[PDB]
Design goal:
Three copies of one chain form a homotrimer. By secondary structure, chain A is mainly β. The first copy, chain A, has one helix and 31 strands. The complex binds a molecule of 7 linked components (NAG-NAG-BMA-MAN-NAG-MAN-FUC), a molecule of 6 linked components (NAG-NAG-BMA-BMA-NAG-FUL), a molecule of 2 linked components (NAG-NAG), bromide ion (3 copies) and holmium atom (HO) (4 copies). The PDB classes it as viral protein.
Amino acid sequence: YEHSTVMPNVVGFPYKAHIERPGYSPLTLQMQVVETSLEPTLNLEYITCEYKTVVPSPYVKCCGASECSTKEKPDYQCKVYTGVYPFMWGGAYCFCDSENTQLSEAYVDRSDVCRHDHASAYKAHTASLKAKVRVMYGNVNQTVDVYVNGDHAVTIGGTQFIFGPLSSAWTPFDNKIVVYKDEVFNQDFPPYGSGQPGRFGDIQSRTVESNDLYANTALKLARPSPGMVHVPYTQTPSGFKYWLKEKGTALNTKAPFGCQIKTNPVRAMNCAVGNIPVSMNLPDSAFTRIVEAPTIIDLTCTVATCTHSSDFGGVLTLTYKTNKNGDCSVHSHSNVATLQEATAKVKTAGKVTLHFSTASASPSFVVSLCSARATCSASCEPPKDHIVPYA
Amino acid sequence: YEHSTVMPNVVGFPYKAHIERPGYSPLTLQMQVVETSLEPTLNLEYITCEYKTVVPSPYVKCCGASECSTKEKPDYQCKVYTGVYPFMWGGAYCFCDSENTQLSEAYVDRSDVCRHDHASAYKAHTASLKAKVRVMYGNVNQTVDVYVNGDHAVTIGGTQFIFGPLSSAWTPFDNKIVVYKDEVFNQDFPPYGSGQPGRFGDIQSRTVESNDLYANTALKLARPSPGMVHVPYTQTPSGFKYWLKEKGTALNTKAPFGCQIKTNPVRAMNCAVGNIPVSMNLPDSAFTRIVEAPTIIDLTCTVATCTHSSDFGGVLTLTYKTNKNGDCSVHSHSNVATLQEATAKVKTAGKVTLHFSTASASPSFVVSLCSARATCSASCEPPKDHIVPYA
Amino acid sequence: YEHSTVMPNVVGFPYKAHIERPGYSPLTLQMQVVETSLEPTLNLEYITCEYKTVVPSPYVKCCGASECSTKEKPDYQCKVYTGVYPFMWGGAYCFCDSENTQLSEAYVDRSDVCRHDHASAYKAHTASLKAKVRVMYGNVNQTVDVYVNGDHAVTIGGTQFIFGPLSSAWTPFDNKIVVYKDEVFNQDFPPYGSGQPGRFGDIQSRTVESNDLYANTALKLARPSPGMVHVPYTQTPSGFKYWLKEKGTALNTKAPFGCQIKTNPVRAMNCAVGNIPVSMNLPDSAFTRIVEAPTIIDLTCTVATCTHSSDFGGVLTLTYKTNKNGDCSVHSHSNVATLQEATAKVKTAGKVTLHFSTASASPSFVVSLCSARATCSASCEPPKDHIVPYA
Ligand SMILES: *[C@H]1O[C@H](CO[C@H]2O[C@@H](C)[C@@H](O)[C@@H](O)[C@@H]2O)[C@@H](O[C@@H]2O[C@H](CO)[C@@H](O[C@@H]3O[C@H](CO[C@H]4O[C@H](CO)[C@@H](O)[C@H](O)[C@@H]4O)[C@@H](O)[C@H](O[C@H]4O[C@H](CO)[C@@H](O)[C@H](O)[C@@H]4O[C@@H]4O[C@H](CO)[C@@H](O)[C@H](O)[C@H]4NC(C)=O)[C@@H]3O)[C@H](O)[C@H]2NC(C)=O)[C@H](O)[C@H]1NC(C)=O
Ligand SMILES: *[C@@H]1O[C@H](CO[C@H]2O[C@@H](C)[C@@H](O)[C@@H](O)[C@@H]2O)[C@@H](O[C@@H]2O[C@H](CO)[C@@H](O[C@@H]3O[C@H](CO)[C@@H](O)[C@H](O[C@@H]4O[C@H](CO)[C@@H](O)[C@H](O)[C@@H]4O[C@@H]4O[C@H](CO)[C@@H](O)[C@H](O)[C@H]4NC(C)=O)[C@@H]3O)[C@H](O)[C@H]2NC(C)=O)[C@H](O)[C@H]1NC(C)=O
Ligand SMILES: *[C@@H]1O[C@H](CO)[C@@H](O[C@@H]2O[C@H](CO)[C@@H](O)[C@H](O)[C@H]2NC(C)=O)[C@H](O)[C@H]1NC(C)=O
Ligand SMILES: [Br-]
Ligand SMILES: [Br-]
Ligand SMILES: [Br-]
Ligand SMILES: [Ho]
Ligand SMILES: [Ho]
Ligand SMILES: [Ho]
Ligand SMILES: [Ho]
């Protein structure tokens, strides 16, 4: 005997069957997902951070003018200044009633703070997704691992179980992301040797200790000002600093489908998409599913704040009355609005907060809490102004 | 009793079972998908449109030459012109070198037409996908909603149904799109402050009413021409206009898997990918599937026009003979060619048009109509020439 | 009667049921996947290759001032100077009062080698995914095709089979790729008219025979050097050549989920993600699944070489003892490490090599071979240094 089924891939909402095998005491099978880990394969492309300008001591020369070649230094520059000979100071500096020459030069290197303050630009692709399912068969509790890259057969309670491959493997991570501290961003970060001044990627290197530093800060050598010889130049404030102010909110709180982002190993958790098929040694006869959901009534939607076209810029709040504290499912029956989370716990208190998203100022959607529906009407404000860069 | 099954996620091709429950009159269950809505979470990055050059009145000055600083204006420019055009007040008074300094300046602001003619660049990620399934149980017809972010249990006809989560959620939308009018494009549009002259994103601002206008039109101040003082300058014709001519065909007609694009709320409809699992209170004994497909013969392929390496640039036409008007499935058994639609209605007329795609000039694939096969042979022309920009 | 099931979408690991239909001889059904083809819809954006500089005949002036306009050639460059004073005159030709003049110019065109040595930048999106399943029903063997864009009903062995739509359609290809020879890369290649000097896309054209050549090699006209008139200029070595050295490893060996890349028609093979649901005319009573996996013990992990944050930069080697040569499944129970392949053949020899990936130097994960586990401890080196471009 082999009975096949399929449970939802959502952490929380359980599967409860009432296995009444003709023999004696009836078993109450119940398996539900408790975790979901989707780790991508980060392929570090490069890292960027505050840069540090570097100009060595200048070469005071006479009319015996020199000419600077070209070395291998990040954004390295050099210019021989003719008749910029600062002129005068004490003794005799170039009596030639014509002109001397100034050999000014300067390059770039990543600030001494990169080590403990830099962002990373990885190129990630979903590597594997596995889930932990806790099955409570009668008087036995066991946790099984389920993947996408293959099924998994296990024997629990003297019964054989086979948790077929997860239907799909959805990822909230794009193919190009940027990890800063504990934050993760989905940015189409400029390629390696393609950074632009005053913008993310101002300077670039494979790693902090790397030795392939690339920069493009628009370092421009200016002509010396009479008085005390020094090296004047124009640049463009650390793009990295600029990015810090620009870069919006992280994925950490804009992840769809209730997906939760984490940073150390970098992964998406409890992402709610798909189903997990199972099968056992029992006739579809002994099997009988149980569906006991918290009955709720007097639903009421209330939108506090809401922002126009921005990943979940709205905030809905549902008031209600329940008969039993539980865990319900939330949905939107209007394509004009989308819900971030895909579930919410229903407490007898009567308060549920959800984040929604829409691109229509003044939208009118209908949210749902289990089997109850309610309308939501709100007026949203357009997205914040950007942070204009060096104009 | 719990019997599990799974129907295709294609709008049209139905599921028909013959439930012969031992009691009496036999039931004829039949459930099929009728719609599919996959809405993404657009996160407006910025919008662009035709720009408008703005040059204020010029500052006529004497040899008492002035020097222009630098204000905060889009692509703002200014240049002090030393020694321009012989004309004067009094009797050529200035004197002190130069003869005449000119303070010319000009910046940019989005054209007065952006409001009702601008494109939008959103950053979208699949937010939710739901489908409408019409189940016709015996003498009862009911429509149920099915999602990916969770299952859904419903009671219909005194029988309990549970439409498990949709297998997967495929999206024809990339992570960076551009919405113009009723069209949608998959473009890796340049980032915010990174627009280039004569190219899409010439100017950029979060919103039309925004106040973070960014531009890079390559505005260059030219020296005045003797005669009537005015402000000469070089620019680069509105990249936006250029884009209009460049931007190929929209996704609206290049969407794979028969997916249909829509614009108001922005979503993909009837996308044909996946399956929808269901389960009821009935033994696999009373269940018996029915598969009555239109039998067709004398299949014949004929390729009219075909373009090389371009999203579905070919057009196949199948002639045939059917026994009953119905709805068949179309497929390609040769990796060298791919079919856009995944189904086609079979009329007794004998005419079926399909769009195919291949990257091989002179390909030889085999299309299929239900259970009938036929060969297609055609010779394709390479893709159209691009529209070279300001050379 | 209709019994539903679901087999894994992995080439190799089979499905084996023991159909004991009360009638006579017990049947041994066994169906397994043998291939998987996911072809995308490449939409050729443009191609690039080594460029070739072109310099017309130098306008050897003398007593005039021929001025240059703006030709329509690729990145036209024209400058006119007033030197070349070695002598070269004679008087009988140029008895002028004014000094010499000279108008030099150049433009670009793709090297004569593009035809048989160029890369291509396509814009690809999954078009269709089909799989070949070999079902061995009793004393009959038949191969059926299964897709995502619809189900497929077939009759084999006098029994009716319906292979529902594949759960999902995972693709290892991004939305922007680059095909070179037999290699495929996932690169966010610069758009059409947006190429940069000394970088991939130096020059760009829709096709090799195209007539929309675009270039940006930073061609700079230099002033002639006294002696023999010629045309001096500065450029930037073929970005294409640079790319050749830069462009890392191809997708061909970094494809996740054991996916295998191919080049002629361009597709991903045996990609192991998902499940394939089936159904027949038999009670869940006659059905009984069989799961006979090779029992292995004395597992031992040994990491040879390992590279930090780079798509599968590590290499694990498992030693062991088996009871029967077979085919096992490999997994990682630690989010800190991911396995490339999703299966491995188990020979009595006792040697299995796997590629893993992690972003943590000095990681400690636990690999698995069927039902056996083992720990892996290794220390990895950071990713190679990039290849700094023209500094
Ligand atoms: C297989 O798994 C089954 C289900 O999963 C749970 O397994 C356990 C082992 C954990 O790993 C959980 O994380 C899993 O969810 C097992 O069944 C569960 O067993 C556990 C262990 O006893 C039960 O834990 C208890 O949880 C409740 C939670 O509160 C809510 O309970 C329900 C909702 O489910 C409602 O009534 C209501 O909404 C409640 O709010 C909690 O009350 C308990 O916690 C308190 O007591 C424990 C010890 O008794 C203590 O550790 C905590 O600090 C809590 O506070 C006080 O502690 C002191 C001493 O520490 C006590 O003296 C005092 O009484 C406590 N005061 C309070 C706050 O009342 C407790 O942790 C859980 O309820 C079961 N889940 C189910 C099915 O409902 C199953 O046992 C296992 N297999 C088997 C059968 O072996
Ligand atoms: C359960 O669902 C069944 C099927 O639902 C389908 O609905 C369509 C619209 C799609 O969504 C499909 O994918 C669904 O599967 C229901 O059965 C359907 O019943 C209707 C009516 O019996 C059928 O629809 C008709 O089909 C005929 C062809 O036989 C058309 O001529 C007809 O066109 C018109 O319909 C409008 C209604 O908007 C009428 O006002 C109009 O006059 C015209 O009707 C025809 O009028 C002329 C007089 O001028 C008369 O001579 C014709 O007899 C009359 N036609 C009929 C029969 O209506 C319309 O499209 C549909 O074909 C049936 N589906 C099938 C093929 O099984 C069933 O009723 C549902 N159960 C319940 C009660 O909820
Ligand atoms: C179904 O496939 C099997 C392979 O699994 C075929 O069996 C092979 O039979 C030949 C000759 O009898 C042997 O040399 C192989 O070793 C067999 N393979 C195995 C492991 O069974 C079988 O013939 C096929 N069924 C048909 C078409 O009759
Ligand atoms: Br990149
Ligand atoms: Br961007
Ligand atoms: Br592009
Ligand atoms: Ho600025
Ligand atoms: Ho041009
Ligand atoms: Ho990009
Ligand atoms: Ho260089």
